[PDB]
Amino acid sequence: PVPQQNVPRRLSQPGLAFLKCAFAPPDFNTDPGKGIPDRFEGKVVSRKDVLNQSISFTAGQDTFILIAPTPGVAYWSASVPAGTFPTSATTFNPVNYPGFTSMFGTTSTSRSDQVSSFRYASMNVGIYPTSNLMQFAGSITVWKCPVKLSTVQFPVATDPATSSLVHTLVGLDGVLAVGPDNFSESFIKGVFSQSACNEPDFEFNDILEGIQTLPPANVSLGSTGQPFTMDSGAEATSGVVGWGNMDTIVIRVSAPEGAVNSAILKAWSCIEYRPNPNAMLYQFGHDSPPLDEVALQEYRTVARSLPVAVIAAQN
């Protein structure tokens, strides 16, 4: 017998405001968001973004819209022939929130001059048709996909040979088919959906630099493994700043031949920031609310007990 050793021998006002910013944006005169009542109690800056865009859908084509958790960008859109899905030859383009240059500069390597971290708290969308009851035809479908940002590694034949590491997106294949959980109705009724945190806690994420297109330049689409390409265009107008811990909303609008469709698109955000002492927005900040367990539990309960989407009459 070998001997053995070392053997061991009610709610609070910040919480209600957080829930209101999370779940019911358009039912109040002023946005009541204050912050996330978690353990962290440092210096943060809260920003709220709203977009009001008028859009007309081209007949005979399928339009896809993604509400991604990328700060400063409202949505990405692409169009494909009717009855089909995005393929390797499709490209998505962004539509910016107002005042992108005022917060992320005019160069690819100047995105962290004012802020260095962020975390999401809410993300919503809405569509309101603006056509008469004779022109329109089609339907609207909504479903969610869990897209994340990761890295890929492949060899390159240089002199001498080396290895490369670049950013990729994992989970984009959920756009290529309709998910079992979805909301589908007629076009004239509208839609209203939201999102929720896909993490057991709230954590701050860094601000990435130099990202313009995924996949980046001089890299082929085959090596990356993505089903399609995300492009932002000129650096002086828009770019990619980061990826938060929220799910992505996918919207498809189908219109048959001879149909005239018009609507109004809206978006929301409830996002915290970590400001730099030399930034001009540092003076608008405050401290994060203290801990509140009841609000943190009811948030998950309500998020679990909600439908995927509702018609525009129940916003």
């Binding site: 779940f23 019911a24 358009p26 039912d27 209203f192 009811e298 309500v302 007990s305 509702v310 129940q314």
Partner: peptide, 13 residues
């Protein structure tokens, strides 16, 4: 009615 539905769930528990 979106907020009126939220208060229903909280009042339930």
């Amino acid at each position: 009615s979106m907020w009126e539905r939220v208060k229903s769930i909280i009042k339930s528990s």
